[PDB]
Amino acid sequence: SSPAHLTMPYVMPGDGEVVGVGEPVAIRFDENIADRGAAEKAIKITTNPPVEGAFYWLNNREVRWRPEHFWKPGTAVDVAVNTYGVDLGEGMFGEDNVQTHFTIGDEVIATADDNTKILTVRVNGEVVKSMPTSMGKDSTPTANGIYIVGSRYKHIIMDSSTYGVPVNSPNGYRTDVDWATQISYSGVFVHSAPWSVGAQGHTNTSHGCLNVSPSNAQWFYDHVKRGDIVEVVNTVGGTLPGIDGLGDWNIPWDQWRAGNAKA
C-alpha cells in the first residue's frame, strides 16, 4: 500500500459508546485529504431525533461534524463512512468503509467562573457539585470558552522529554499527576493538585490547568465522560482556539456550517 495513494478512515466515538452533549463526530484519515468535498460527500450521518449538522476540518486529515447546539440527551447517531474506492483527491483512494453507532447521554456542563473561582457541575440543568479551583496565573491564564472533555487518566506523567526538552534543565519537567481529565489538546486538564488546595476558590496559581483538590479531581474523573463540557468564563485569558482539537464549540455556527472544504 502506498501512503500517497491509499488512505484508511477512522471514526470516533467508537461503536456503542455513550458520550456527552459536546461530542462531535470525528473522521480521521491516515493521510492528507486533497479533495475535502469528496470526503464529506462520502460520509453519511443519521441522527434520531434528526438534527441539522455540518462538517469542519481541523487539519488536513481530520474532519468534524456537529450540530449548532449541544446534542439532546438520548440522541442516537449512526455514521457511515463510505470511502472504499472513492477518489479523495490527487490519486488518493479510500481503502475501506467504516461505521459507528453511538448515543448521547446526560447533559453535563461544568462552569468555572474566575469571579468565584468555583467549578460548578450541572447535570441536566441541576447543580450537583461545586468545587474550588485554582486556574492560570494572570501571566499564564486559562483561556475562556467551551472545552470538550477528552481522555482521562488515573495517573499521568507530564514529561518535557517528549518535546526534546531535557528533564534536568530550567524548563524541563517530569511531573506526576493524579485524576487528570483532559479538556484541551493544548494540555489543559482538570486534575488533582494537592499543592494548591489552600488557594483553590481564592487565588489563581497554575500554569493554565484547572487545579482542584485530590478528592474533587477523583469525583470529576468518576462523574464525567468524553464529550461532556467545561466552560471557562471571566478569566484574563483569551479564548480557546476553535481548532484546538477539543475547542470545536468556540467556532461560531455560521463559520462552522460554511465549512472549509474549499477554504
Q: Is 37 annotated as a binding residue?
A: no
Q: How many residues does the chain have?
A: 263
| Residue 186, marked binder | yes
Verify cis geometry, omega within 30 degrees of 0, for the bond prior to 73: no
Per-residue DSSP letter, 52: -
- Among candidate residues 106, 126, 161, the one where a domain is terminated: 106
Cα–Cα distance, 92 to 4 (Å, whole number): 6
Is residue 135 within 8 Å of 143, Cβ to Cβ?
no
Q: Are 112 and 12 part of one and the same domain?
A: no
What is the spatial distance between Cα 102 and Cα 23, in angstroms, rounded to a whole number? 11
Burial 72-84 (b: 16+ CB within 10 A, else e): eeebebebbbbbe
- Both 98 and 113 in one domain: the answer is no
Which among 225, 141, 155 is positioned nearest to 183, based on CA atoms?
A: 225
Q: Is 62 annotated as a binding residue?
A: no
Instruction: Please give the residue range of the domain that contains residue 157.
Output: 107-263
Same domain flag for 203 and 97: no
DSSP symbols for 171-206? T--EEEEEEEEE--TTS-EEEE-GGGTTTTTT---B
Task: Output phi, psi for 221, to 5 deg.
Answer: -50, -45
**Residues pairing with 3 in the sheet:** none
**Contact assessment for residue 113 and residue 105, using Cβ atoms and an 8 Å cutoff:** no
Any known ligand binding at 198? no
127 contact partners, CB below 8 Å, separation of at least 6: 120, 121
- Name the experiment that determined this structure: X-ray
The CATH number for 24's domain is 2.60.40.3710
- Do 114 and 179 share a domain, yes or no? yes
> Catalytic annotation on 209?
yes
CA gap 38, 86 in Å, rounded: 8
To the nearest 10°, the Cα dihedral for 13, 84, 259, 187? Answer: 40
Residues 224, 147: Cα–Cα separation, whole Å: 13
Q: Which residue(s) pair with 223 in the sheet?
A: none
Pair (69, 121) in one structural domain:
no
Apex 224 CA angle, 178 and 147, nearest 5: 90
Strands 25-29 and 6-7: unpaired
Cell numbers at 101, concatenated:
453507532
Tell me which long-range contacts 240-245 makes (C-beta under 8 A, separation of at least 24): 240/143, 240/144, 240/145, 240/146, 240/147, 240/184, 240/186, 240/188, 241/186, 243/58, 243/59, 244/184, 244/185, 244/186, 245/58, 245/150, 245/184, 245/185, 245/186
Instruction: Please state, in angstroms and rounded to a whole number, the distance separating the CA atoms of residues 245 and 163.
Output: 19
Helix H, strand E, coil C: the string for 21-45 is: CCCCEEEEECCCCCCHHHHHHCEEE
Resolution in angstrom units: 1.8
Beta-bridged to residue 11, according to DSSP, are 27
Which listed residue (101, 191, 202, 207) is catalytic?
A: 191
For 159, the enclosing helix (H) or strand (E) is strand 152-159
With contact defined as beta carbons under 8 Å apart, do 73 and 106 qualify? yes
Residues 16 and 64 in one domain: yes
Burial pattern 128-152, b for ≥16 Cβ within 10 A else e, equals: eeebbbbbbeeeebbbbbbbbbbeb
Is 211 assigned a ligand-binding role in the annotation? Answer: yes
Separation of alpha carbons 55 and 249, rounded Å: 13
What total number of domains does the chain contain? 2
Residues 46 and 118 grouped into a single domain: no
173 known ligand binder: yes
> If we measure between CA atoms, which residue out of 84, 37, 39, 32 comes closest to residue 61?
32
Choosing from 69, 202, 209, 223, the catalytic residue is 209
Any binding-site annotation on 228? no
